[PDB]
Design a protein around this ligand. Structure first.
Ligand SMILES: [Ca+2]
Length: 320
């Protein structure tokens, strides 16, 4: 054990959609990652927010995270935190950095849909095809109940229709208008913005990375193929041991046919770009990014624990 990852300010890990600190109180969202960071000297706190909510709004994840951050500061005696968000958690982290900029030293986003998800667009379009709303009522109720039952604290504030809308491309574009950041490039550029921001006189270091396991191949009859570059084709252990591997290849194929380009199954490379983009080359699907399921990743996927650890060192060397 050592101080490789000892940052000045505590690290707050911020989960995305479906999440909680520990599913059913048994499976860490950030599997193995708090342990590894702490072994290397980081002070690490894991937020437990609604798995299904918007980021803004009085009932949203942003205000939940703000309240949590204030408790972390009081406990640690620190004046700021380093926010590290996966998936929607990067959007939640942006909210806190905008509304409480004096409490934040840095924002790092991992597979965050800054520009939304084409898969969310697909789901919302399908629900809109039923004019009765019954599909929305039934599916969202099931998802909400999943959220309640799997939340470590049985948090009953679960609104799957709000989270779905939040993660659409149209709504993300509105979010970016409402909560701008210098870390964002222009819409449609597929390029990042500035590596730092000063918000209300408070400087924030901005970082991101993305997984691009799912790559487009050939188009035949208007249908574009895809391949999962994380895996040995077909026979990779990850296809057998982690049900998300094949599922995210499928969702990523759908997204490619909606015009996403390369993606992690749920978030495109372009959507994920923010601040200083440290990599978009990891052969990762969306939950490989958080060392899931149970550390299982394709043979060609880099170790996400080591990537996060190295980033804590980067933060340390940057003075946060
Ligand atoms: Ca995996």
């Amino acid at each position: 054990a050592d101080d490789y990852a000892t940052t000045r300010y505590p690290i707050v890990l911020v989960h995305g959609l479906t999440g909680t600190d520990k599913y059913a109180g048994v499976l860490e969202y950030w599997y193995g990652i708090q342990e590894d960071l702490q072994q290397h000297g980081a002070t690490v706190y894991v937020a437990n927010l609604s798995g299904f909510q918007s980021d803004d709004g009085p009932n949203g994840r942003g205000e939940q995270l703000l309240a949590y951050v204030k408790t972390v500061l009081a406990a640690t005696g620190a004046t700021k935190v380093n926010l590290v968000g996966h998936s929607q958690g990067g959007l939640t982290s942006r909210y806190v950095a905008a509304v409480a900029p004096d409490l934040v030293a840095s924002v790092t986003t991992i597979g965050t849909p800054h520009r939304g998800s084409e898969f969310a667009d697909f789901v919302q379009g399908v629900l809109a095809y039923d004019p009765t709303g019954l599909s929305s009522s039934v599916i969202a109720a099931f998802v909400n109940v999943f959220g309640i039952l799997t939340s470590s604290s049985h948090n009953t504030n679960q609104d799957a229709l709000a989270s779905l809308k939040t993660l659409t491309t149209a709504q993300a574009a509105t979010y970016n208008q409402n909560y701008p950041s210098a870390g964002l490039g222009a819409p449609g550029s597929c390029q990042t913005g500035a590596p730092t921001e000063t918000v209300g006189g408070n400087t924030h270091l901005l970082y991101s990375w993305a997984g691009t396991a799912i790559q487009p191949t050939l188009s035949v009859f208007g249908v574009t193929g895809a391949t999962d570059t994380s895996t040995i084709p077909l026979v990779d252990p990850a296809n057998a041991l982690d049900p998300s591997t094949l599922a995210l290849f499928g969702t990523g194929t759908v997204m490619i046919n909606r015009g996403s380009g390369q993606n992690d199954g749920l978030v495109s490379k372009c959507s994920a770009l923010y601040g200083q983009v440290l990599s978009t080359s990891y052969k990762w699907n969306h939950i490989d990014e958080i060392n899931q399921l149970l550390g299982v990743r394709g043979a060609f996927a880099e170790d996400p624990v080591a990537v996060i650890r190295t980033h804590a060192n980067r933060l340390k060397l940057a003075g946060v």
